[PDB]
User: Which sequence fits this backbone?
RNA sequence: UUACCGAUACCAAGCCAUAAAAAGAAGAAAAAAUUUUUUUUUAGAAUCUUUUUAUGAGUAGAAAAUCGUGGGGU
RNA sequence: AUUUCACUCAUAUUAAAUAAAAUAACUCCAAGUGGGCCAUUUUUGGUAAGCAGAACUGGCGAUGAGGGAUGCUCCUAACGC
RNA sequence: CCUAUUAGCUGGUUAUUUUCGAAAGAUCUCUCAGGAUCGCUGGAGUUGAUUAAUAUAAUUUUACCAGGUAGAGAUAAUGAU
RNA sequence: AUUUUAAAAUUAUUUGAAUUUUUCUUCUUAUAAUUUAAGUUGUUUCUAUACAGUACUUUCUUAACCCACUCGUCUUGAAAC
């Protein structure tokens, strides 16, 4: 039994080591990509052309309207997304179908392209996780990696950093990770919304559009 | 007295409480009143097949016995 | 309000009085749940009587404990005292209302021997 | 297992480290970066300036071009208006 | 820096085009400067304008670039002319208004207030068509001409906007509006 | 609030605890529940569930039927969570090893004669706690006469549901709507 | 009040402009099998076998074929529940639906792709990738060919 | 343009109940006294115990668990 | 067409996404209900109506809380302590 | 006295908590103040699911049909003009 | 009464590397302790050297701030003139 325990410990240590390297790699990538974007922009500026950045792959979508006075279609869409309360946020893999769905629920949500730091913050401060036999879940905050290394061991994402990476750049194993994440129960924003009635792109003050960068600020406020 | 003589109001909602239930989709719908002649031919074929199978089984049994 | 004493949290010192028990003598204060369309208590309008609810319940661990921290056990007879020789810290005796003065005294004596608290030792004193 | 607190990963250093093993190294790096004194930074500014000239020029050209385009558009609009009036 | 004073209208250069098709591989790109409160708003405005002018909708085009133009000399007073299209409750109108300001953005901020105030024209109903600095030989509006006068001077007839600390509701002595 | 079905809480549709107060049966369920939970063997769980079930869903399994089921694999032990009844319609009885909740006396006798074994559930557990070399069987469930009145109501076309009638004979439910001659049929 | 078998059919069953006449003689050669999906498109030039108003346009599995008939299992939404309706039609109205054939084509192509993959042992992702976001690009445009835009004045 | 105030909604934590989920047929821990005494506990009730997570509006209505009255056997 | 043999079709990203999708199906027994009313939007009759009559959806009814001074239905938002 | 006649109508219909929770559509009815039967609800139960699956979805993509309302037309047909 | 362990983290030691040359540089070989782990612990007063006091807990009674319409009932809708 002691021997077995020792073996287990060793395995754990190995996993941790592996994780660290992976994390480092991810870090290296992130900065590099950013640098490259800048370089590309510079090149474009130099040589008359334009560089359009890659369309943003994920989208963090925060619900605004609550449960009452909602059409059936929109309710269905919400259910599909997994936003059930007023300020349930969730990551969503931007697609064609997904986009269409969003458009159907556009007036009842905000969304945008989260940004890595914001995502990380969400995962750490607000990231809970479904831990149980399928359809019987229990919303557990992560803290340890063993929590998540169980369910997502198969798919080669142990620990929160891997998950974060997956989220940021819709990886091979994004969907599963997203599913594993219990919908983000956010606060209301500490300075406040402008007006949930009106759209974000309305020239007057509003909220419900695709605030495509500025979502991050909102998230920060309401983390 | 005069009445709300008809409305389809709420009906949809009512329907959607237990979903619009699909038919269960069974592999074998009955061939009861469908194409005669053909279906009797089919029946005959099936019978023949069964007979063949039985004969085979019998043969096997015999072999086992020695 | 909430009535902390130590680990004992009581969520509701006030009794839930029957609606309108204050208005008509015939309506006793014993809680009765208002059925009836238009009740206002049933409908829970601000400013009316509250409805007892399972939210008000005391924590499973401290529930029937008195301010003593001891479960009350009512006792009619010396024999009954004996179950609580092995539980003299967790349970406290109350002597039944119908027990005679001599018998009461005897019970009290027994309790003292056991070190078990008696919550109504003073009856007929 | 009995649920206890839920520890604030972002701050609670130990918890953070448990979560993300690499984190420590990153934090050390950050600290190191923070450490280095302002003289060096100041010096680097000159270098940056030296390196920037071409880029600056390019930027100017771009923005100038944009402005020119706008002006041309305006002129065209004016001409159109004049024509309409005529 | 003062955040009570700011109006957060910026100017954005947006460039976009229709997505290439087998039938039209090399489509035209369109640009514009757009006065908007943020980058996303700017984009949306651009899309709207594309829709209005060309056959082009956000779903069948792509934004090539969104730049953000910061004023080059944000502390030089300039005389800005603007040409608007706006909608009244009764109908639709052009007008040309002039604003002496420190940046295009500032002028536009002024403009929106003025249209809201003077015509009850809300931001939705307005379309800025061009703003350009008018050199003072061609300034047509009298309220701008006056400012352009040689050795400009005037007294300070505004009332004090004391800080909320020293705004106290009981006063020893009846304050004076004259000052000097 | 939260837009959910049944608000959060998960419906479970079946039995929970046996409503029986039969001390032996309670003991049995205790045992098999324990076995289910520890020896997560499926078999055990199934057994537990069947023990919990009501009397109609523990229909009697006939000796003949048992024999038929055992036919292909001999020696292994048929387990039946209900009663096993004897069959006069059988002639010969093979060497059967059967666990059941109840054996009707004659059936038991027959089994004994066959040189077989009647095992109770505790015995089975003792012998085969993971149900190795066992076979769960059920008697005919929807063969009940009550069940013949269920389904589509007689009146709906192509329904083979017995009407609840006082008696049989021409005088009772054999005219209008039962023959083309009296309006319609079925 | 008036719910006859051809009500609300002034346009459903009207033959389209410059397509009167009758069903072409080559339409009777469409091969059908017990399982084919099948549109029901009421050519009202034949009055025999005319399926009801509602089934016009609705597809279904063929469950029965006859001399000149086709039984079609078609779903009908009926208040609280969809149910299977056995619509017996002539061939003139039943047209072979095309949805299934799109799938069929894909299947065929996929088989070939699978074979190719096996030839070389590779993890080819078959499943249709939906229109995702576009990747990064660097689009060369001359400053000559970038037509600046302003809103339009009113007229 | 900021800042603020502002719900039984949101968030964090606690407690109640419901639902489901984990999981369960042997042993010294401490303090106080002065190495030995005294003080409390030293659990194992399956519709039960421990822990977890989510959820909690409600007339007509349905159900379950409780509470009480007159009498019966124990 | 059915049958039995072959050979072989993506699969852990699961033959496009997304899904507190099995809280599902199904059977049984029975309750209450079968006077409705309002709001947007579409709409019929009518000069119109807080009128009569419909459609889609949501409410009220059965529902309090915060706002609309006040208010069965508007806005926010649905309620264990 | 039969007789506590009958009433599709009016009034009333007695403890607590917890849990789930409607309908005021539809068809037939000497029916329109009622009833039956569907619908919606509860309970009971079984088979399932418990394997982040497959069934399944008031959802969307990708194909593929069906349409004749808004619009449009009158130097296209009909009917105005 | 052994997931309040394990590991993470930290301190003081010990072996070997690394390019972020660094009194918080990182990993790892071993060893001890610690808490940032592994949901509040301590110190000092007070109640008090008290047996009920004017303190403490609690009932009632008044005020005060805010709120609160007659319950039952048929009814789409009752505080209803
Ligand atoms: Mg606001
Ligand atoms: Mg609204
Ligand atoms: Mg009411
Ligand atoms: Mg409730
Ligand atoms: Mg009512
Ligand atoms: Mg409401
Ligand atoms: Mg008002
Ligand atoms: Mg009478
Ligand atoms: Mg409910
Ligand atoms: Mg009445
Ligand atoms: Mg029509
Ligand atoms: Mg028209
Ligand atoms: Mg008041
Ligand atoms: Mg009335
Ligand atoms: Mg009333």
Assistant:
């Amino acid at each position: 039994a002691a021997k077995k325990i020792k073996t287990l410990k060793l395995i754990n240590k190995k996993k941790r080591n592996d994780l660290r390297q992976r994390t480092l790699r991810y870090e290296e990538e992130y900065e590099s990509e950013r640098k490259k974007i800048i370089e590309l922009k510079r090149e474009a500026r130099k040589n008359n052309c334009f560089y359009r950045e890659a369309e943003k792959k994920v989208v963090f979508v925060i619900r605004l309207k609550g449960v009452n006075k909602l059409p059936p279609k929109v309710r269905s869409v919400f259910r599909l997304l997994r936003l059930l309360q007023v300020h349930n946020g969730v990551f969503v893999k931007v697609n064609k179908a997904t986009k269409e769905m969003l458009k159907i629920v556009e007036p009842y949500v905000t969304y945008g392209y989260p940004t890595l730091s914001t995502v990380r913050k969400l995962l750490y401060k607000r990231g809970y996780v479904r831990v149980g036999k399928v359809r019987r879940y229990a919303r557990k905050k992560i803290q340890d990696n063993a929590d998540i290394s169980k369910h997502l061991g198969k798919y080669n994402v142990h620990g929160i950093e891997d998950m974060v990476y997956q989220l940021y750049t819709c990886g091979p194993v994004f969907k599963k990770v997203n599913n594993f994440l219990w919908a983000f129960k956010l606060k209301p924003p500490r300075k406040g919304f402008k007006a949930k009635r009106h759209a974000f792109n309305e020239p007057r003050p509003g909220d419900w559009g695709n605030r495509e960068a500025h979502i991050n600020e909102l998230i920060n406020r309401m983390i | 007295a005069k009445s709300k003589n008809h409305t389809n109001h709420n009906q949809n909602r009512k329907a959607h409480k237990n979903g619009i239930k699909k038919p269960k989709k069974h592999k074998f719908m009955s061939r009861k009143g469908l194409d005669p002649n053909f279906f009797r031919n089919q029946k005959y074929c099936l019978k023949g097949i069964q007979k063949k199978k039985k004969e085979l089984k019998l043969k096997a049994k015999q072999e086992k016995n020695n | 309000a909430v009535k902390k004493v130590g680990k004992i949290i009581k969520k509701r010192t006030k009794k839930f009085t029957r609606f309108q028990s204050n208005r008509f003598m015939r309506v006793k204060p014993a809680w009765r749940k208002p059925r009836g369309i238009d009740c206002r208590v049933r409908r829970r309008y601000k400013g009316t009587n509250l409805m007892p609810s399972i939210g008000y319940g005391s924590n499973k661990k401290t529930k029937f404990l008195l301010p003593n921290n001891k479960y009350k056990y009512v006792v009619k007879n010396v024999k009954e005292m004996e179950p609580l020789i092995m539980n003299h810290t967790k349970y406290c005796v109350q002597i039944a209302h119908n027990v005679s003065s001599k018998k009461r005294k005897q019970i009290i004596e027994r309790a003292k021997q056991m070190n078990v608290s008696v919550i109504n030792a003073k009856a007929r004193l | 297992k009995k649920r206890l607190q839920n520890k604030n990963s972002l701050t609670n250093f130990a918890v953070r480290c448990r979560l993300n093993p690499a984190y420590k190294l990153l934090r050390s790096l950050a600290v190191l970066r923070m450490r280095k004194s302002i003289l060096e930074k100041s010096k680097n500014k000159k270098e940056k300036r030296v390196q920037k000239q071409i880029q600056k020029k390019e930027l100017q050209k771009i923005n100038h071009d944009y402005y020119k385009g706008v002006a041309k558009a305006v002129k065209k609009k004016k001409k159109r208006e004049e024509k309409k009036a005529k | 820096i003062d955040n009570s004073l700011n109006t957060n209208i910026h100017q954005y250069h947006i460039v976009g085009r229709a997505i290439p098709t087998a039938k039209d591989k090399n489509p035209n790109v369109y640009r514009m400067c757009i006065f908007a409160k943020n980058d996303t708003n700017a984009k949306s405005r651009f899309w709207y304008f594309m829709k209005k002018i060309n056959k082009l909708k956000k779903s069948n085009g792509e934004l090539l670039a969104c730049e953000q133009i910061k004023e080059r000399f944000p502390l030089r007073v300039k005389n800005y002319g603007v040409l608007l299209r706006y909608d009244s409750r009764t109908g639709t109108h052009n007008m040309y208004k002039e604003f002496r300001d420190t940046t295009k953005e500032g002028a536009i901020a002024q403009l929106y207030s003025e249209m809201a105030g003077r015509h009850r024209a809300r931001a939705s109903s307005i379309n800025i068509i061009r703003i350009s600095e008018i050199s003072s030989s061609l300034v047509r509006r009298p309220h701008i001409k006056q400012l352009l006068k040689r050795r400009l001077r005037f007294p300070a007839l505004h009332l004090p906007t004391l800080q909320k600390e020293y705004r106290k509701k009981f006063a020893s002595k009846r304050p004076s509006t004259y000052r000097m | 609030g939260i837009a959910l079905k049944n608000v959060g809480r998960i419906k479970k549709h079946g039995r929970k605890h046996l409503v029986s107060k039969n001390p032996y049966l309670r003991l049995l369920v205790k045992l098999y529940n324990f076995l289910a939970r520890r020896t997560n063997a499926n078999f055990n769980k199934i057994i537990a569930k069947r023990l919990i079930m009501p009397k109609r869903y523990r229909p009697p399994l006939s000796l003949s039927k048992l024999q038929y089921h055992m036919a292909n694999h001999p020696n292994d032990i048929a387990v039946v969570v209900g009663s096993i009844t004897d069959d006069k319609r059988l002639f010969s009885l093979k060497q059967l090893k059967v666990c059941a909740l109840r054996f009707t006396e004659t059936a038991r006798k027959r089994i004994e004669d066959a040189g077989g074994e009647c095992l109770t559930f505790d015995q089975l557990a003792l012998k085969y706690p993971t149900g190795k070399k066992c076979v769960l069987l059920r008697g005919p469930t929807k063969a009940r006469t009550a069940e013949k009145h269920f389904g589509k109501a007689p009146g709906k076309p192509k329904s083979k549901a017995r009407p609840y009638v006082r008696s049989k004979g021409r005088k009772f439910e054999k005219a209008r709507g039962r023959r083309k001659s009296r309006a319609y049929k079925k | 009040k008036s719910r006859g078998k051809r009500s609300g059919t002034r346009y459903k069953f009207s033959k389209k402009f410059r397509k009167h006449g009758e069903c072409t003689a080559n339409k009777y050669l469409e091969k059908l099998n017990y399982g084919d999906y099948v549109d029901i498109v009421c050519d009202s030039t034949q009055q025999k076998g005319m399926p009801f108003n509602y089934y016009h346009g609705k597809t279904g599995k063929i469950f029965h074929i006859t001399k000149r008939g086709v039984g079609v299992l078609v779903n009908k939404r009926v208040k609280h529940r969809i149910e299977q309706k056995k619509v017996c039609v002539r061939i003139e109205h039943v047209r072979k639906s095309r949805c299934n054939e799109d799938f069929l084509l894909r299947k065929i192509k996929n088989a070939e792709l699978i074979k190719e993959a096996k030839l070389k042992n590779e993890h080819i992702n078959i499943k249709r990738k939906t229109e995702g976001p576009k990747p990064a690009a660097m689009i060369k445009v001359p400053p000559s060919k970038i037509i600046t835009i302003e809103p339009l004045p009113f007229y």
Notes: The first strand of chain F starts at residue 61 and ends at 62. The longest helix of chain F spans residues 23-38. The radius of gyration of chain F is 22 Å. Residues 6, 9, 11, 13-15, 53-54, 56-57, 141 of chain F lie near RNA strand J (CB under 10 Å from a C1').
